Curated annotation (Swiss-Prot), chains A, B:
PANTHER family: TRIOSEPHOSPHATE ISOMERASE. GO terms for cellular component: cytoplasm; cytosol; glycosome. It comes from Trypanosoma brucei brucei. It comes from the Eukaryota. Its EC number is 5.3.1.1. It is found in: Glycosome. The enzyme contains a high proportion of positively-charged residues in beta-barrels V and VII (compared to the homologous regions in other triose isomerase sequences). Since 2 clusters of positive charges located at precise distances on the molecular surface are common to 4 glycosomal enzymes, it has been speculated that this might represent a signal for entry into glycosomes. It holds the Pfam family TIM. Signal peptide: none annotated. HAMAP family: TIM_B. Homodimer. The lineage of its organism: Eukaryota, Discoba, Euglenozoa, Kinetoplastea, Metakinetoplastina. This is Triosephosphate isomerase, glycosomal. One of its GO terms (biological process) is glyceraldehyde-3-phosphate biosynthetic process.
Length: 249, 249
């Protein structure tokens, strides 16, 4: 049987205090009847209002990035600062940070290891671009990324690690990957974890899919065997995110 | 004579909820006689707490970084989000962001221009490192940095602009800067503004010294003709930042 599903909401760099408050009101009054870990990743600025406002028992607050240690790094937020603030979940290694802000496979890995060592629950983001897919390099690309992450981690650290496979071609483009495209990618990841890390770990590991998911395609995507939830971006700002949660059985 | 001095506290990626609150409480209980604009620049996480705790009427709050627009930029904060959050000041182009996070002269200039257009008071940071100073390109680097910013600004926009000069060569590198060296860099900046933008702008332009400043040398540093205040790093986390404020006469 699949492990506990996860419906992660990546608001990215969006939202006002009022528009996010109205979105938080919907989540609080949302009745969820199955076991699923819902995750709301807001900006650093909106973390305080989200902590006080969102009170749903199946929801947790997360950050979208962090650096390992505190110090003379103007503009950045560290893991001890987030931990002092009461934030225990975090999204790390998003393709936008991998592309825009120079986060390599090794920088992402060292951030994951530091967060797990700080007690964080980490959603590590991997995935291939469109040029890597049409060149037939989705396999080497995706696994190269997770291999760097696993290298900096021990076996017991995977209980704090969640993998979110997001193909860059599907992120914010409206071109969702078909259930076969998602299942073939998640199965390729899970078998690597079973071979290198362990079979018990690969069974415990949660592989989420992200990329233009909405209320209409979520149910059919989750029916695949190796899909343990969703990382939602554009639809996480809209009332249909409730439907994405319910689509996790 | 001199325009309104500025005492800006750059806490960088530092602080806990308890430690920063005690520091804010000490700031709030401090009697400041003369006219001076005090600025507290915390991490995004602590902006909400600083917004409630800080009550001293001569104090405002600032961000340490931002991107121009909101959108699909996981982990970053944008200017409209900060403006919606009640943040009216911002520090941009800090040397640590120019070195670690790919902020070039053009990228810095684009953020400053977008910040002014969004209603922000901008503390724009410039300065040269030791290698650039030992190789004798202080005037080359410093003037190139401010020219990149100026070519994206109109004459009226300089009312919202504050320049911070960072002597990167004299911050924790064993080299002790003298007040005469700070004055020379400040006079270099202002005279260029006077001939390139206008003498009226240069007369009102606040040029802040962003070196290693303590409450002792801050008096002699501020006595220089073209020093209009300080952009403090390490001492800004300490109660002696108050002494740096009072050193602005
Ligand atoms: Na006042
Ligand atoms: Na002015």
């Amino acid at each position: 049987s699949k492990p506990q599903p996860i419906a992660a909401a990546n608001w990215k760099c969006n939202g006002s205090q009022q528009s996010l408050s109205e979105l938080i009101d919907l989540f609080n009054s949302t009745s969820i009847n199955h076991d699923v870990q819902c995750v709301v990743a807001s900006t650093f600025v909106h973390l305080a209002m989200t902590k006080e406002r969102l009170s749903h028992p199946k929801f947790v607050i997360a950050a979208q990035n962090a650096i390992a240690k505190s110090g003379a790094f103007t503009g950045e937020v560290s893991l001890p600062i987030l931990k002092d603030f009461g934030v225990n979940w975090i999204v790390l290694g998003h393709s936008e940070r991998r592309a825009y802000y120079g986060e390599t496979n090794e920088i992402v890995a060292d951030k994951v290891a530091a967060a797990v060592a700080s007690g964080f629950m980490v959603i590590a983001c991997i995935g291939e671009t469109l040029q890597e897919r049409e060149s037939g390099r989705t396999a080497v690309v995706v696994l190269t990324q997770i291999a760097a992450i696993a290298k900096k981690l021990k076996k017991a650290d995977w209980a704090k690690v969640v993998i979110a496979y997001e193909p860059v071609w599907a992120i914010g483009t409206g071109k969702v990957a078909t259930p076969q495209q998602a299942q073939e990618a998640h199965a390729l990841i899970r078998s690597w974890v079973s071979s290198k890390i362990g079979a018990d770990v690969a069974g415990e590991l949660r592989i989420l899919y992200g990329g233009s998911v909405n209320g209409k395609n979520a149910r059919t995507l989750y029916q695949q065997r190796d899909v343990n939830g969703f990382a939602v971006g554009g639809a996480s700002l809209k009332p249909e995110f409730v439907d994405i949660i319910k689509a996790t059985q």
